Design a protein around this ligand. Sequence first.
Ligand SMILES: *C(=O)[C@@H](NC(=O)Cc1ccccc1)[C@@H]1N[C@@H](C(=O)O)C(C)(C)S1
Length: 640
Amino acid sequence: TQAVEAGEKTVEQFVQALNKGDYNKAAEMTSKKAANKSALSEKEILDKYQNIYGAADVKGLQISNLKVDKKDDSTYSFSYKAKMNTSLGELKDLSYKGTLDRNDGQTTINWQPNLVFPEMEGNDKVSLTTQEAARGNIIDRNGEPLATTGKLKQLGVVPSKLGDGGEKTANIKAIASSFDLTEDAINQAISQSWVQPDYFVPLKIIDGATPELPAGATIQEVDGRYYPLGEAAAQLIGYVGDITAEDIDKNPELSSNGKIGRSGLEMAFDKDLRGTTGGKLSITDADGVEKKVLIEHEVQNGKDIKLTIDAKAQKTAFDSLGGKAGSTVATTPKTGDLLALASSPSYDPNKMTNGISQEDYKAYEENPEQPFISRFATGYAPGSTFKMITAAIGLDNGTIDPNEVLTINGLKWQKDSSWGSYQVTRVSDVSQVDLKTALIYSDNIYAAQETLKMGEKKFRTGLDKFIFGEDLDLPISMNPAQISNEDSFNSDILLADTGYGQGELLINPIQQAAMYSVFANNGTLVYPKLIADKETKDKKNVIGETAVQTIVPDLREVVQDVNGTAHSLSALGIPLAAKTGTAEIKEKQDVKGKENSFLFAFNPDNQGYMMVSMLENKEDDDSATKRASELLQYLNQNYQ
Ligand SMILES: *C(=O)[C@@H](NC(=O)Cc1ccccc1)[C@@H]1N[C@@H](C(=O)O)C(C)(C)S1
């Protein structure tokens, strides 16, 4: 038994070397090639495993139920059960047998072809046939296609029919004029290092209509991933890329020919969309004589994913941003159905997944506005929109009397002389300001005063009833919203700033649409959902219904009153409750300030839709309220 324990370590270290992918170090643990010892040499075992295990993409070899006994003077027979992962799934309940040899203190392994697979007897071969799985589709709440594998048309060229010499550059310029392509790229694609005379070199995928083809131009019907809305849902949906050899080493269930989600929902639901690879793994005789089948199952196509998105809303919400930095979130606030999640500027996902040039991909990341960013998942200072939450908290704890009128003189104010030169600033110089007036003119001094009066203890007590710090159950990578950096402001100044949506607040537009949903459900927070079938989760009693029926009628006046900060929306003539905001951020790239324009709006009659729009680093006299006219008309018409 003093050497039997050393033998159980030899079997354990041998499986480790196989599982670690180092087939050579495993072969160095086998005996010499003989009839009673190992059946092959060390270099032959290396090529045997590397050729077989590599063909099935074998990874993760784990053993159990080891039993090492004795047999002869120097021979100890060993046995174990094993499981491993292949291109076609898990191979479980494998029975392995063999013998060891301790000719001295060292114990080696009498290697045998039955250690590659349980029943491989001698010069048996292994075959693998796989049927590739079709990637599932992503669809909106009405069945419209957002991400599908469609039939595309590809414009390529064959350099043999282009022309002799002068007629070749003429056809290269004639093809560049009939397809809006750089004429220097037509000669740069046919002169790549992989081109041969009679080869088909693709140029770019034709969108829709096929113009006249010049001398040596042809179209090849190819199938691939296709995104109908394109840039409008690029950040939400995402794109898929070619699966690499390094990808299969991580998860061998992938198809080495298929596509894999790289960002967005295509990556979040990569498992449910790629399906499962189908095929058969079998051991054979000397020829293709199929002996024993190890693994076999039919191919399974990918499940389709139905979103709460409305394609019409997503496209309108994106187009309303005009290519400027911003985002828009539209929900049915009673259920949380995310109707649209737009981000701008954006990238073309079809040119990204079919064939992007080495320079066009550099322009997307060198772009300072960062089109790759999902701005509906980025934390911001919510701005003056946050006064709704501050007021609703101040009404529940009774700190704010809706009819009490603070007397404010001027445009700057500070609590004590201990604030130095800092002062809360408001835009309108109204002498007598109550709750209704402060929400109309968007008065920061009013909000700052009532926050300081409320006290930090009573303030956070109302804030904690929301979703600050929580992780929403959404397939979108985001950070949880925060009140401040630490669990205490420890500054009268910072407490005031948090009252009107500045300070250390970080809330992304999706979380904002969640927190603001209380004003459409009588103080009940409705969690947003992107998957159509997920049950509606909610959070009761976030703010009192007293504050809802007080602020919601006031929010109508933000639109209806002639001095309201959203009066440009009165032209719609629809029932609207809104609240605008313009927060300022401290940009280190330039001393000039950068300011973001916000807009919250919903229907206070039927609560059928809720909207949160923003413009990051806005241009002069630009605002989210300016661009919301179109989306509000659609959401009011189609979601009562
Ligand atoms: C909230 O954003 C309020 N004002 C401020 O925070 C100060 C400020 C910052 C930049 C520009 C102007 C004022 C009020 N809300 C906005 C809005 O509703 O868009 C106003 C500009 C009306 S001031």
